[PDB]
Design a protein around this motif. Structure first.
Motif, PDB file in Angstrom:
ATOM      1  N   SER A 107       1.665  -6.023  10.203  1.00 22.83           N
ATOM      2  CA  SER A 107       0.925  -4.990  10.147  1.00 22.83           C
ATOM      3  C   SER A 107       2.034  -3.688   9.682  1.00 22.83           C
ATOM      4  CB  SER A 107       0.212  -4.351  11.407  1.00 22.83           C
ATOM      5  OG  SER A 107       0.006  -3.078  11.493  1.00 22.83           O
ATOM      6  N   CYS A 108       1.572  -2.823   8.869  1.00 23.75           N
ATOM      7  CA  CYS A 108       2.175  -1.438   8.853  1.00 23.75           C
ATOM      8  C   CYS A 108       1.946  -0.496   9.980  1.00 23.75           C
ATOM      9  CB  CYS A 108       1.774  -0.824   7.506  1.00 23.75           C
ATOM     10  SG  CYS A 108       2.876   0.625   7.005  1.00 23.75           S
ATOM     11  N   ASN A 109       2.432   0.705   9.891  1.00 24.76           N
ATOM     12  CA  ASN A 109       2.194   1.552  11.025  1.00 24.76           C
ATOM     13  C   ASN A 109       1.902   3.089  10.335  1.00 24.76           C
ATOM     14  OD1 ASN A 109       4.785   1.973  10.009  1.00 24.76           O
ATOM     15  ND2 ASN A 109       5.787   2.191  11.987  1.00 24.76           N
ATOM     16  N   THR A 110       2.267   3.137   9.166  1.00 24.55           N
ATOM     17  CA  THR A 110       1.930   4.555   8.721  1.00 24.55           C
ATOM     18  C   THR A 110       0.486   4.422   7.736  1.00 24.55           C
ATOM     19  OG1 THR A 110       2.394   6.419   7.346  1.00 24.55           O
ATOM     20  CG2 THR A 110       2.995   4.245   6.503  1.00 24.55           C
ATOM     21  N   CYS A 111       0.044   3.294   7.224  1.00 28.93           N
ATOM     22  CA  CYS A 111      -1.092   3.027   6.542  1.00 28.93           C
ATOM     23  C   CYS A 111      -1.650   1.601   7.211  1.00 28.93           C
ATOM     24  CB  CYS A 111      -0.756   2.658   5.099  1.00 28.93           C
ATOM     25  SG  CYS A 111      -0.358   0.818   4.772  1.00 28.93           S
ATOM     26  N   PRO A 112      -3.047   1.717   7.207  1.00 26.54           N
ATOM     27  CA  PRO A 112      -4.092   0.715   8.145  1.00 26.54           C
ATOM     28  C   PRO A 112      -3.853  -0.653   7.480  1.00 26.54           C
ATOM     29  CG  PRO A 112      -5.128   2.392   7.693  1.00 26.54           C
ATOM     30  CD  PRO A 112      -3.930   2.787   6.714  1.00 26.54           C
ATOM     31  N   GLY A 124       0.778  -1.249  -0.154  1.00 28.22           N
ATOM     32  CA  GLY A 124      -0.033   0.136   0.010  1.00 28.22           C
ATOM     33  C   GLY A 124       0.858   1.303   0.047  1.00 28.22           C
ATOM     34  N   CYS A 125       1.814   1.202   0.711  1.00 30.88           N
ATOM     35  CA  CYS A 125       2.771   2.368   0.840  1.00 30.88           C
ATOM     36  C   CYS A 125       4.243   2.063   0.813  1.00 30.88           C
ATOM     37  CB  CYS A 125       2.327   3.015   2.220  1.00 30.88           C
ATOM     38  SG  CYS A 125       2.972   2.191   3.787  1.00 30.88           S
ATOM     39  N   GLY A 126       4.763   0.979   0.851  1.00 29.68           N
ATOM     40  CA  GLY A 126       6.087   0.646   0.764  1.00 29.68           C
ATOM     41  C   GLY A 126       6.823   0.811   1.941  1.00 29.68           C
ATOM     42  N   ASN A 127       6.835   0.189   2.915  1.00 35.36           N
ATOM     43  CA  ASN A 127       7.577   0.340   4.132  1.00 35.36           C
ATOM     44  C   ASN A 127       7.599  -0.921   5.008  1.00 35.36           C
ATOM     45  OD1 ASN A 127       7.857   3.609   4.610  1.00 35.36           O
ATOM     46  ND2 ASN A 127       5.757   3.225   3.956  1.00 35.36           N
ATOM     47  N   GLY A 128       8.473  -1.035   5.889  1.00 29.85           N
ATOM     48  CA  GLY A 128       9.003  -2.064   6.772  1.00 29.85           C
ATOM     49  C   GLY A 128       7.505  -2.412   7.493  1.00 29.85           C
TER      50      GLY A 128
HETATM   51 ZN   LIG Z   1       3.824   2.305   5.823  1.00 29.03          ZN
END
Ligand SMILES: [Zn+2]
Ligand SMILES: [Mg+2]
Ligand SMILES: [Zn+2]
Lengths: 49, 199, 78, 50, 107, 50, 209
Positions: E24-29, E7-11
């Motif tokens: 789970s991500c932490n900047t997007c749900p 969704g947003c490209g993060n660890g």
């Molecule tokens: Zn993220």
């Protein structure tokens, strides 16, 4: 003085001192290092030191 | 290419010699500063500048490294005996046998002056004398010589000849060499060690 | 009694020779007949050889005591 | 008593001996490298192949 | 081994807040609840175990067969092998002999 | 020293005491053996060996 | 396992009792050549042996001069000895009315008790070691020469011979392992017999400081 342009005088380095200590000659290095370099005479007060 | 590799290998020695001027000089400086004060006293001790004892006897033996003839020992008994045999031939005296040699050695060493000598040295001399006295026995046995001295081919007495005068001279020379090989009082016994390790 | 070695150590030889040479350099009587030498140190060496040097050694021990030895009763060797 | 170039000129039999020794040594080195590069070389039990 | 949120490209991180854990991500749900296995790791790291058995530790490892030296051959050195660094690198062996006053030990 | 352009210093002691100490303790004849282990140092040199 | 722990127990018993004998306290010769199988005979296997008691020993006394003087040797079990434990040993000690004691810890002992172990009392002193050290008797080691403690008469004769004041002798640290082994206190002089490379011998003395 130090050079040959000025009249010189050769140096009794820190190693010749140890050589002369090794020989055990006690008056010779006294003659080399005080009598014939800068033998100076001062006066000292024993009351104040 | 060989010329270039040879020069490449050679320049290492020049660089090494140029570098060496500092490390050894500094080490000798430190060592001679540390060891300068030690001296040999009249009690045979060596003491620091404050009278504190560093050793109870210099080097255990008390002997001078520069007066040593052997490998760290003051004598090589074989060499001294051979010299004394050669310089003092005894054409008239009779060759000694094992028992007579032991008796005369014991008699000579019994004098007071030898008792003044160091004990270990007397032990060494006894060992060497016993060894040579045992060596002569094999030679006398193999050829069947008689201790009475009456064997007819007299050249057989030339094999392991030794006479009382030669024994006396050998013992006196050994003792004299030992007495003169000591470390004299007043010696700068600290600076010598520093120079001898630094150089 | 006396305990120190009877041999004259090289340091004693050096200082005795030097002090006697200095004494002879200043006008001082010479004990032994001199052949004609003019160097004081050689005259001192001859005085030592003949055992006529008028000097006394005082060997100081580290504890404080001492022993007096005459130059003519030490064993002067090579 | 003198030293000259004649004192350092190589002899005859020395040349043959040196030639033979060089050939033998180079051949032996080539066989060792051959053994290594194919993996046949036995690893001396004090270090790896190099 | 690592994953990234599409969704947003993060660890992403793992956390539990319901009946089952979830990626789970932490900047997007974005949430992806985990329900199966994965079969790879980061290859963890713990240091050199050298003297945990030093000397003559538990004698349960007494063994019968051993090699022999090419020179001398007195009866005392049974065999040994060990390992170099980690999971997927070779295992070295050394053969070592010791009576006194030398420095023999082969590889 | 090796006589390739080297130089050496020289001192003249100015006292009888210094003279005696130098002659007896530093004399060349009294220093034929090095004090490190008692082996001679002043002996023959090249071209006296030949 | 269950033999290596007992092997250590047997070795440390041997070494500690060698130390006791060298100090001069009362000991029986038959116990000196005790075998490991003998230890197994006199004490059961590891599961049947309770560390804090199964090696306690106090029979040793200073029979040489005063058989009434007894010594305590204690063997804690916990890796680090606590204050309450040392209090237990000290109260048992006061019950038995001895003056000095000895402790052997497995791994260490807490800093609070580290501090306490120096100021329990002037009249009482306690000796501390580790199992690792006692696993071998250093006095049998190759490098270590022979140390001999010597009486006041001998030291008086010594410093009368060479004409010293006692503070000029070379010093041996009070914490030196051999000093701890012989348990000597400050103000004592130890003769040392250095073996020469030949049959000869050298003799030197050092003062504890
Ligand atoms: Zn993220
Ligand atoms: Mg040059
Ligand atoms: Zn004033």
């Amino acid at each position: 003085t130090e050079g040959r342009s000025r009249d010189g005088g050769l140096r009794l380095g820190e190693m010749e001192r140890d050589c002369l200590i090794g020989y055990g000659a006690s008056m010779l290095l006294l003659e080399r290092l005080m009598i014939s370099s800068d033998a100076f005479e001062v006066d000292v007060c024993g009351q104040c030191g | 290419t060989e010329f270039f590799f040879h020069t490449m290998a050679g320049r290492e020695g020049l660089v090494d010699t140029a570098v060496k001027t500092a490390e050894t000089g500094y080490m000798q400086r430190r060592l001679v500063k540390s060891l300068e004060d030690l001296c040999s006293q009249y009690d045979l001790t060596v003491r620091s500048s404050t009278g504190d004892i560093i050793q109870f006897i210099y080097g255990g033996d008390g002997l001078d490294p520069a007066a040593m003839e052997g490998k760290d020992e003051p004598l090589e008994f074989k060499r001294v005996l051979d010299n004394i045999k050669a310089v003092f031939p005894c054409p008239s005296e009779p060759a000694l046998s094992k028992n007579e040699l032991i008796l005369t050695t014991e008699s000579i060493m019994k004098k007071s002056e030898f008792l003044c000598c160091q004990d270990s040295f007397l032990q060494e001399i006894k060992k060497f004398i016993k060894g040579v006295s045992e060596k002569i026995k094999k030679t006398r046995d193999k050829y069947g010589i008689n201790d009475n001295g009456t064997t007819e081919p007299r050249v057989l007495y030339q094999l392991d000849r030794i006479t009382p005068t030669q024994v006396e001279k050998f013992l006196e020379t050994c003792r004299d060499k030992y007495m003169r090989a000591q470390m004299e009082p007043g010696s700068a016994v600290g600076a010598l060690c520093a120079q001898s390790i630094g150089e | 009694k006396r305990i120190t070695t009877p041999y004259m150590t090289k340091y004693e030889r050096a200082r005795v020779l030097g002090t006697r040479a200095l004494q002879i350099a200043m006008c001082a009587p010479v004990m032994v007949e001199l052949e004609g030498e003019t160097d004081p140190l050689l005259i001192a060496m001859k005085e030592l050889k003949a055992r006529k040097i008028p000097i006394i050694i005082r060997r100081y021990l580290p504890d404080g005591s001492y022993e007096d030895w005459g130059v003519d009763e030490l064993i002067i060797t090579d | 008593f003198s030293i000259g170039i004649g004192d350092v000129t190589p002899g005859q039999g020395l040349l043959k001996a040196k030639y033979e020794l060089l050939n033998a040594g180079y051949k032996k080195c080539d066989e060792y490298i051959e053994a290594l590069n194919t993996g046949k070389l036995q690893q001396q039990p004090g270090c790896t192949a190099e | 081994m690592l994953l990234f949120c599409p969704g947003c490209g993060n660890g992403l991180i793992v956390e539990e807040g319901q009946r089952c854990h979830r990626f789970s991500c932490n900047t997007c749900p974005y949430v992806h609840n985990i329900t199966r296995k994965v079969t790879n790791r980061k290859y963890p790291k713990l240091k050199e175990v050298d003297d945990v058995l030093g000397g003559a530790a538990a004698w349960e490892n007494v063994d019968s067969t051993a090699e022999s030296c090419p020179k001398c051959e007195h009866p005392r050195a049974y065999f040994m092998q060990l390992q170099t660094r980690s999971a997927d690198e070779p295992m070295t062996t050394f053969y070592k002999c010791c009576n006194a006053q030398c420095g023999h030990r082969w590889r | 020293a090796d006589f390739d352009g080297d130089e050496m210093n020289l001192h003249l002691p100015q006292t009888e005491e210094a003279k005696a100490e130098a002659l007896v303790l530093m004399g060349t004849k009294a220093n034929l053996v090095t004090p490190r282990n008692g082996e001679p140092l002043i002996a023959a040199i090249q071209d006296f060996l030949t | 396992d269950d033999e290596e722990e007992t092997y250590r127990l047997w070795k440390i018993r041997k070494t500690i009792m060698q130390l006791c004998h060298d100090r001069g306290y009362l000991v029986t010769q038959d116990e000196l050549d005790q075998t490991l199988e003998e230890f197994k005979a006199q004490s059961g296997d590891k599961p049947s042996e309770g560390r804090p008691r199964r090696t306690d020993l106090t029979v040793l006394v200073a029979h040489n001069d005063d058989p009434t003087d007894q010594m305590f040797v204690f063997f804690p079990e916990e890796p680090k000895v606590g204050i309450k434990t040392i209090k237990v040993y000290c109260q048992r000690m006061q019950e038995e009315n001895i003056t000095r004691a000895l402790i052997v810890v497995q791994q260490g002992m807490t800093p609070s008790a580290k501090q306490s172990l120096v100021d329990m009392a002037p009249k009482y002193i306690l000796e501390q070691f580790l199992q690792q050290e006692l696993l071998i008797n250093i006095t049998e080691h190759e490098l270590v020469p022979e140390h001999v403690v010597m009486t006041k008469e001998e030291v008086t004769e010594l410093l009368a011979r060479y004409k010293l004041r006692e503070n000029q002798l070379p010093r041996i640290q009070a914490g030196d392992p051999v000093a701890r082994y012989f348990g000597i206190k400050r103000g004592q002089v130890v003769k040392i017999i250095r073996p020469s490379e030949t049959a000869g011998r050298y003799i030197t003395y050092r003062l504890v400081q």
